Amino acid sequence: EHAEHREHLKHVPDSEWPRDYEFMNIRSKPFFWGDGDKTLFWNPVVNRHI
Amino acid sequence: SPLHTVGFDARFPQQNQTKHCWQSYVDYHKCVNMKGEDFAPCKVFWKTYNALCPLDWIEKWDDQREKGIFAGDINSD
Amino acid sequence: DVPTPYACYFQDSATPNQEGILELHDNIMFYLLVILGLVSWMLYTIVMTYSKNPIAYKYIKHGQTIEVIWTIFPAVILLIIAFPSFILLYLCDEVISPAMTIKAIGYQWYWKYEYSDFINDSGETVEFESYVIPDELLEEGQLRLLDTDTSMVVPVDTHIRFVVTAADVIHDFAIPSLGIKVDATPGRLNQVSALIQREGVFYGACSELCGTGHANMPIKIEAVSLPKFLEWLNEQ
Amino acid sequence: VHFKDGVYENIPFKVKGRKTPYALSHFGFFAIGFAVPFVACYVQLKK
Amino acid sequence: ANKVIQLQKIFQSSTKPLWWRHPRSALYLYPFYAIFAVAVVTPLLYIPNAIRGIKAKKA
Amino acid sequence: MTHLERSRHQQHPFHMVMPSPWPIVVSFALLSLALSTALTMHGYIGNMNMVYLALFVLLTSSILWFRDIVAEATYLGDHTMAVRKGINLGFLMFVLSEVLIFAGLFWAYFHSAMSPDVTLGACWPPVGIEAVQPTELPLLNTIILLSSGATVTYSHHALIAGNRNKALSGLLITFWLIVIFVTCQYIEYTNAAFTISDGVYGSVFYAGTGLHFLHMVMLAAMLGVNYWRMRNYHLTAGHHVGYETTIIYTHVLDVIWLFLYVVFYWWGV
Amino acid sequence: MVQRWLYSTNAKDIAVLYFMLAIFSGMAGTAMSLIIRLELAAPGSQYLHGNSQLFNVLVVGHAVLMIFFLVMPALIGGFGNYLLPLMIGATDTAFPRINNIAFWVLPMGLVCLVTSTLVESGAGTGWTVYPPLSSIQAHSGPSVDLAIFALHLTSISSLLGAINFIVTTLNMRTNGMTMHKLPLFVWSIFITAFLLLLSLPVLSAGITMLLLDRNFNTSFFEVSGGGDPILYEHLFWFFGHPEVYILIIPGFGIISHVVSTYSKKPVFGEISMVYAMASIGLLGFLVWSHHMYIVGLDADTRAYFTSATMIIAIPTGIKIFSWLATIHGGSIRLATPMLYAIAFLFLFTMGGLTGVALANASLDVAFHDTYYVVGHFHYVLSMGAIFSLFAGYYYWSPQILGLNYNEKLAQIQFWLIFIGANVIFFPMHFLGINGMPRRIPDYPDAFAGWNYVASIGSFIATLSLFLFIYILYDQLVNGLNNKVNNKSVIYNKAPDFVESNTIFNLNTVKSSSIEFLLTSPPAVHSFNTPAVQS
Numbered sequence A: 001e002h003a004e005h006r007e008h009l010k011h012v013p014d015s016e017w018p019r020d021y022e023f024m025n026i027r028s029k030p031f032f033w034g035d036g037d038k039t040l041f042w043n044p045v046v047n048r049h050i
Numbered sequence B: 001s002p003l004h005t006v007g008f009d010a011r012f013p014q015q016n017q018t019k020h021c022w023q024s025y026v027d028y029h030k031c032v033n034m035k036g037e038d039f040a041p042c043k044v045f046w047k048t049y050n051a052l053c054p055l056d057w058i059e060k061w062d063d064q065r066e067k068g069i070f071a072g073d074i075n076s077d
Numbered sequence C: 001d002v003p004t005p006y007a008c009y010f011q012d013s014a015t016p017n018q019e020g021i022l023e024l025h026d027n028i029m030f031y032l033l034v035i036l037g038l039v040s041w042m043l044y045t046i047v048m049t050y051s052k053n054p055i056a057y058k059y060i061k062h063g064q065t066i067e068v069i070w071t072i073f074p075a076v077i078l079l080i081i082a083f084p085s086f087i088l089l090y091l092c093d094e095v096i097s098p099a100m101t102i103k104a105i106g107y108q109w110y111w112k113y114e115y116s117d118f119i120n121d122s123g124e125t126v127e128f129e130s131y132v133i134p135d136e137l138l139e140e141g142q143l144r145l146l147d148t149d150t151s152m153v154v155p156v157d158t159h160i161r162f163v164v165t166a167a168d169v170i171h172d173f174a175i176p177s178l179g180i181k182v183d184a185t186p187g188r189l190n191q192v193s194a195l196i197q198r199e200g201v202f203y204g205a206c207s208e209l210c211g212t213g214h215a216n217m218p219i220k221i222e223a224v225s226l227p228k229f230l231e232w233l234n235e236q
Numbered sequence D: 001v002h003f004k005d006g007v008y009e010n011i012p013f014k015v016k017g018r019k020t021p022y023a024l025s026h027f028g029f030f031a032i033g034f035a036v037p038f039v040a041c042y043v044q045l046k047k
Numbered sequence E: 001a002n003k004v005i006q007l008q009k010i011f012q013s014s015t016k017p018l019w020w021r022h023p024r025s026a027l028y029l030y031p032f033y034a035i036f037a038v039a040v041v042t043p044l045l046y047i048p049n050a051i052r053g054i055k056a057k058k059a
Numbered sequence F: 001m002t003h004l005e006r007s008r009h010q011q012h013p014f015h016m017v018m019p020s021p022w023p024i025v026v027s028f029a030l031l032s033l034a035l036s037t038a039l040t041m042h043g044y045i046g047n048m049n050m051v052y053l054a055l056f057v058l059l060t061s062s063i064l065w066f067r068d069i070v071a072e073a074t075y076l077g078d079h080t081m082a083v084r085k086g087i088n089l090g091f092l093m094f095v096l097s098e099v100l101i102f103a104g105l106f107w108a109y110f111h112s113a114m115s116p117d118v119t120l121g122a123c124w125p126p127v128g129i130e131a132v133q134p135t136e137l138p139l140l141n142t143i144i145l146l147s148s149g150a151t152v153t154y155s156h157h158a159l160i161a162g163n164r165n166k167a168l169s170g171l172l173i174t175f176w177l178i179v180i181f182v183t184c185q186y187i188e189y190t191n192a193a194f195t196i197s198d199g200v201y202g203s204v205f206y207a208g209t210g211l212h213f214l215h216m217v218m219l220a221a222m223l224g225v226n227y228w229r230m231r232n233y234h235l236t237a238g239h240h241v242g243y244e245t246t247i248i249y250t251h252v253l254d255v256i257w258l259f260l261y262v263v264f265y266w267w268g269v
Numbered sequence G: 001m002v003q004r005w006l007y008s009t010n011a012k013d014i015a016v017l018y019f020m021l022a023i024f025s026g027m028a029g030t031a032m033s034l035i036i037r038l039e040l041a042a043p044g045s046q047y048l049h050g051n052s053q054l055f056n057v058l059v060v061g062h063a064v065l066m067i068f069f070l071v072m073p074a075l076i077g078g079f080g081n082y083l084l085p086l087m088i089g090a091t092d093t094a095f096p097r098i099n100n101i102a103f104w105v106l107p108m109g110l111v112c113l114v115t116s117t118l119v120e121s122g123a124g125t126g127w128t129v130y131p132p133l134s135s136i137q138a139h140s141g142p143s144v145d146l147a148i149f150a151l152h153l154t155s156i157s158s159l160l161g162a163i164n165f166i167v168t169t170l171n172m173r174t175n176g177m178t179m180h181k182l183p184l185f186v187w188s189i190f191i192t193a194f195l196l197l198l199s200l201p202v203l204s205a206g207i208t209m210l211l212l213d214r215n216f217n218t219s220f221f222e223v224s225g226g227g228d229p230i231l232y233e234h235l236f237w238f239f240g241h242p243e244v245y246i247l248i249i250p251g252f253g254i255i256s257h258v259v260s261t262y263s264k265k266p267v268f269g270e271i272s273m274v275y276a277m278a279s280i281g282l283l284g285f286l287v288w289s290h291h292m293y294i295v296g297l298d299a300d301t302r303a304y305f306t307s308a309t310m311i312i313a314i315p316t317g318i319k320i321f322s323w324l325a326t327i328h329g330g331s332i333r334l335a336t337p338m339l340y341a342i343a344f345l346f347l348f349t350m351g352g353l354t355g356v357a358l359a360n361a362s363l364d365v366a367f368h369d370t371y372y373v374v375g376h377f378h379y380v381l382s383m384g385a386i387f388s389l390f391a392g393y394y395y396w397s398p399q400i401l402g403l404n405y406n407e408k409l410a411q412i413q414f415w416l417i418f419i420g421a422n423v424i425f426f427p428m429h430f431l432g433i434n435g436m437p438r439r440i441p442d443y444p445d446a447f448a449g450w451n452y453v454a455s456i457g458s459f460i461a462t463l464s465l466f467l468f469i470y471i472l473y474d475q476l477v478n479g480l481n482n483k484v485n486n487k488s489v490i491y492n493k494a495p496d497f498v499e500s501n502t503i504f505n506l507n508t509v510k511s512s513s514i515e516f517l518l519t520s521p522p523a524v525h526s527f528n529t530p531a532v533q534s
Ligand code: HEA
Pocket: G022, G023, G026, G027, G030, G033, G034, G036, G037, G059, G060, G062, G063, G064, G066, G067, G070, G071, G074, G125, G126, G127, G128, G374, G378, G381, G382, G385, G386, G389, G390, G393, G421, G424, G438, G439, G440, G441, G458, G461, G462, G464, G465
């Protein structure tokens, strides 16, 4: 059921992702792995904010 | 006026007033949309959060309310 | 008010808080001096008597009488000096009807006072940053690392609530003549209450590390009379 | 395991059988220990 | 495979150190010494660029 | 025995350990790890291969130290009753240290939860973050950890009983149980609503559960080397400290997961 | 010599390695303290051209060097690893390789601390590494990360030494020794190892929280994110007061031995001394928030903490009175360890009394972050740890080296460091009670007189340090010569007042501990047959 809900949440446009709050996903510095604004276990389907 | 202020609040008797200022701000914004009939009792919380909160805090909270990012229990209903 | 060269005591008090902690410090220093005199006497007469003792009484080992005596003696000394500490702590923690409230929010190497209860033209809040006067712009007479650009001026003989927080790092709001020392964490506000008993000026410094601009961050409070304070407040 | 034991066998440095004087090693060790902070100051005053 | 008693006789009759006593010990011990020397020479070598201020070019 | 034969031996139980390079090698790898990650966190190195290399050197040096200690335990016969009592007590002290690290993490969680910050909404979890549900995936996690505890005590008692095939089967089963735990935890991290940078809730939540994650992967390595030693007959029926150490590690980590579960889920929701 | 020193596995060689590194880093910490005191002699930038960042960097260098690289390695590592095997009759401590890796993880704590000072701007944060001053918005660059790794590596060293010490003094005792028949130094290292084991986890947690906040965009203490900088204060001081009792309890173990052996009568109420050390170690973990009386705790919280902090004046008072009881009625042979023990007793009572005035929640409004607290802690730290260090060195050095030190030179070294340390740290109480703030490279010019007299006395203290590092040279190159002439004191205990010199010569070592009955320099594996005791 949760995988079905995350597949439903996959087809969400970029203006339809809600208000990321002040405390949410803060970037005090870019990360040194990959390219930047992505953590280790980063799921681009669910965790989209930046 | 010759030297009046908020006074002592029995709900916040300790040293730090950080939730006192926040609760006065949230109750002033909650008196507007919910009740809206008592404009001078609304200004009691206005004078309280004005006397207790820094202006940068009030500016950031006003910006977060206007952009919807504000984390307070504000139900426009 | 102002620190004095080759001083050995507190600065001159200006509030019931500072003279309370001064009387408490002397009341503690009494019993600290009796046990310093006792320890130093015992040590001195012991070495000067027994550095020329040929026979050591090597069988004095347990001695329960003086053991329970010197166990119950520092307990009653601490009880004696912990009664007035409790009285002064619960006395100075009370805030009993403040007649004023001024925020002193301390940014990265300056203070910004905010007289938010009061008016500038009509109703709007008063605020000003108080930078330290630099070394190159000192005129002859002004105290180095203590004399700021604008002083927080404040009415005398009235309860003031200081609501101090910060914006970048922890900055302490410390004035030792007014006996207040409360640091400024960026998360939370912190309140203190003080009523100033005499007019004059009171210097203080940031008593918490602030980065490179730590020393040059003073706090100049000018206790003025209520008509002259009201004139200054309407003038601001 | 068996190592040699004696008056000078307990220490990592060589004091007795030496080509240089020992005072060189003894005061050079504490001298570079005292000059580490001045090298730190020289770097931070260069920058 | 119960090599225990044979390995006991090997490890008790051997004037080699306790990490060289197995017959397979060179097969770990030589490339590990090479990898160790590389891994403790290199971040030491990166120190003068750190105190000089020269960050790594992103190429 | 006589006197000439008692003079051929140790006269004290305790282990005279031979000189060995693994302290200085592990410590040199630890310095290289610290320096490389402090120069890779700030872009003075272009990539993470140096940190990967230093982690590999630290791991293989620790592995070689453990190879020397199982050589001294099994093949040289130095581990007598006093030395076994000593290493048992030393592992118990190290496990107490890990318990206290987790108590510091619990104090962090309880501070940020019992004093809810006004920028969060004065509510725990904060506004906008939806918490991980207790009953869905961590219920499966806690019941497979409790069954892992039951399986290690079964297999340890089967080892003391003399039964070889029950002990090896039980140890293999609990090994695959705790790597099923690590896999379910990684799946939980993969499909989760929030990040480690998502405020103090994501901060202290992923700190506590990622610390338990790393201790469970350490337990996986320990159960693996214990299974290898029990397969290749290193453990005896009465003389075994690696297995006692690994089962008391398993029960300590199980109680730590129980506290983490009930706090972070049945009170944080 | 590659085996014996690099791949070392006996506690004595590791102990002398601990001591060589300890006195090296103590020399460096004293150099940073001299630059602090030399810039702090007059108002205005004197030697550092402005540059308050460099002053704060040297302050954390002197602080973390003298604490985590001098006092802990010397007292814990060197003296514990030399005597905790010996005084209980242990052959060689259990887990010798962990005992080797603790020492060998120390000097890269030194290396990465030195390069933290060298890199981009230096950690300018205090020895308390408080955020947001220590976080990435105030301190960029990798310097605070390397200081955090220095604290991590020395935490690893201290915790591993604690585990090795605990199972050694529990399991590896000799056959006659009950726990109640253990010496006081062994009990002291025991209790300190328990405090290390119960303190260093919380510190490593808080410091890795700080490193995670700096580099991985997480927010444990960042306010923009909801964090509390008071949480780091809580965690650091929950480590930090048990740390200062960790630093002081080996002094309480050394001074008891030297006082009983130069007083020629045993310690007064030895089980009471063990109980008072245990009560201090239990009461340490309960008083950690007297270091933050200013942040705005509740009045009930501070009223609890002033009582709990004052409570430690009772067992420390028990010990400082039992020492006077051990000395009272003896035959005081005033050598250098007895001189350092007497001066430790007096100046430690002074520092603890300034601390007990500091324990009040209402007085710490007047005293926090002033120079009064540095009067308190430099009295208890400098005298109580360094005078204990010098007493233990001058006490155990000719036994564990076989080389006698010059005694006149050692006594002028004591008198120089005593009047030098008094002349520096006594005006700090005046500076604090007049309101001079802490960690400032510059001050209002009203503090200049007491800053000048303390800056004078720092040169007396460091001149006594240089005389000590010449005394080490003289002991090293003229040990046997100082034995054979009358420049040194051969027998620490005289004959009693009936005993003939011949009857003394048949029984020359009258010690209540095994260490003095070992040979000059003790054998590389002594205690072949385990030492028996009734
Ligand atoms: C071990 C602890 C220790 C010791 C011994 C000292 C000793 C000295 N310290 Fe300091 N100091 C600290 C730990 C210590 N200090 C800490 C923790 C801080 C707080 C930092 C902060 O707040 O940010 C501090 C801060 C501090 C300040 C306050 C700075 C400020 O807040 O602005 C000053 C100012 O004078 C100072 C200078 C000195 C001087 C001149 C000595 C002199 O006494 C030097 C003379 C000492 C010796 C000569 C020691 C002997 C040398 C040895 C090597 C031992 C030999 C014995 C054996 C080897 C057995 N240090």
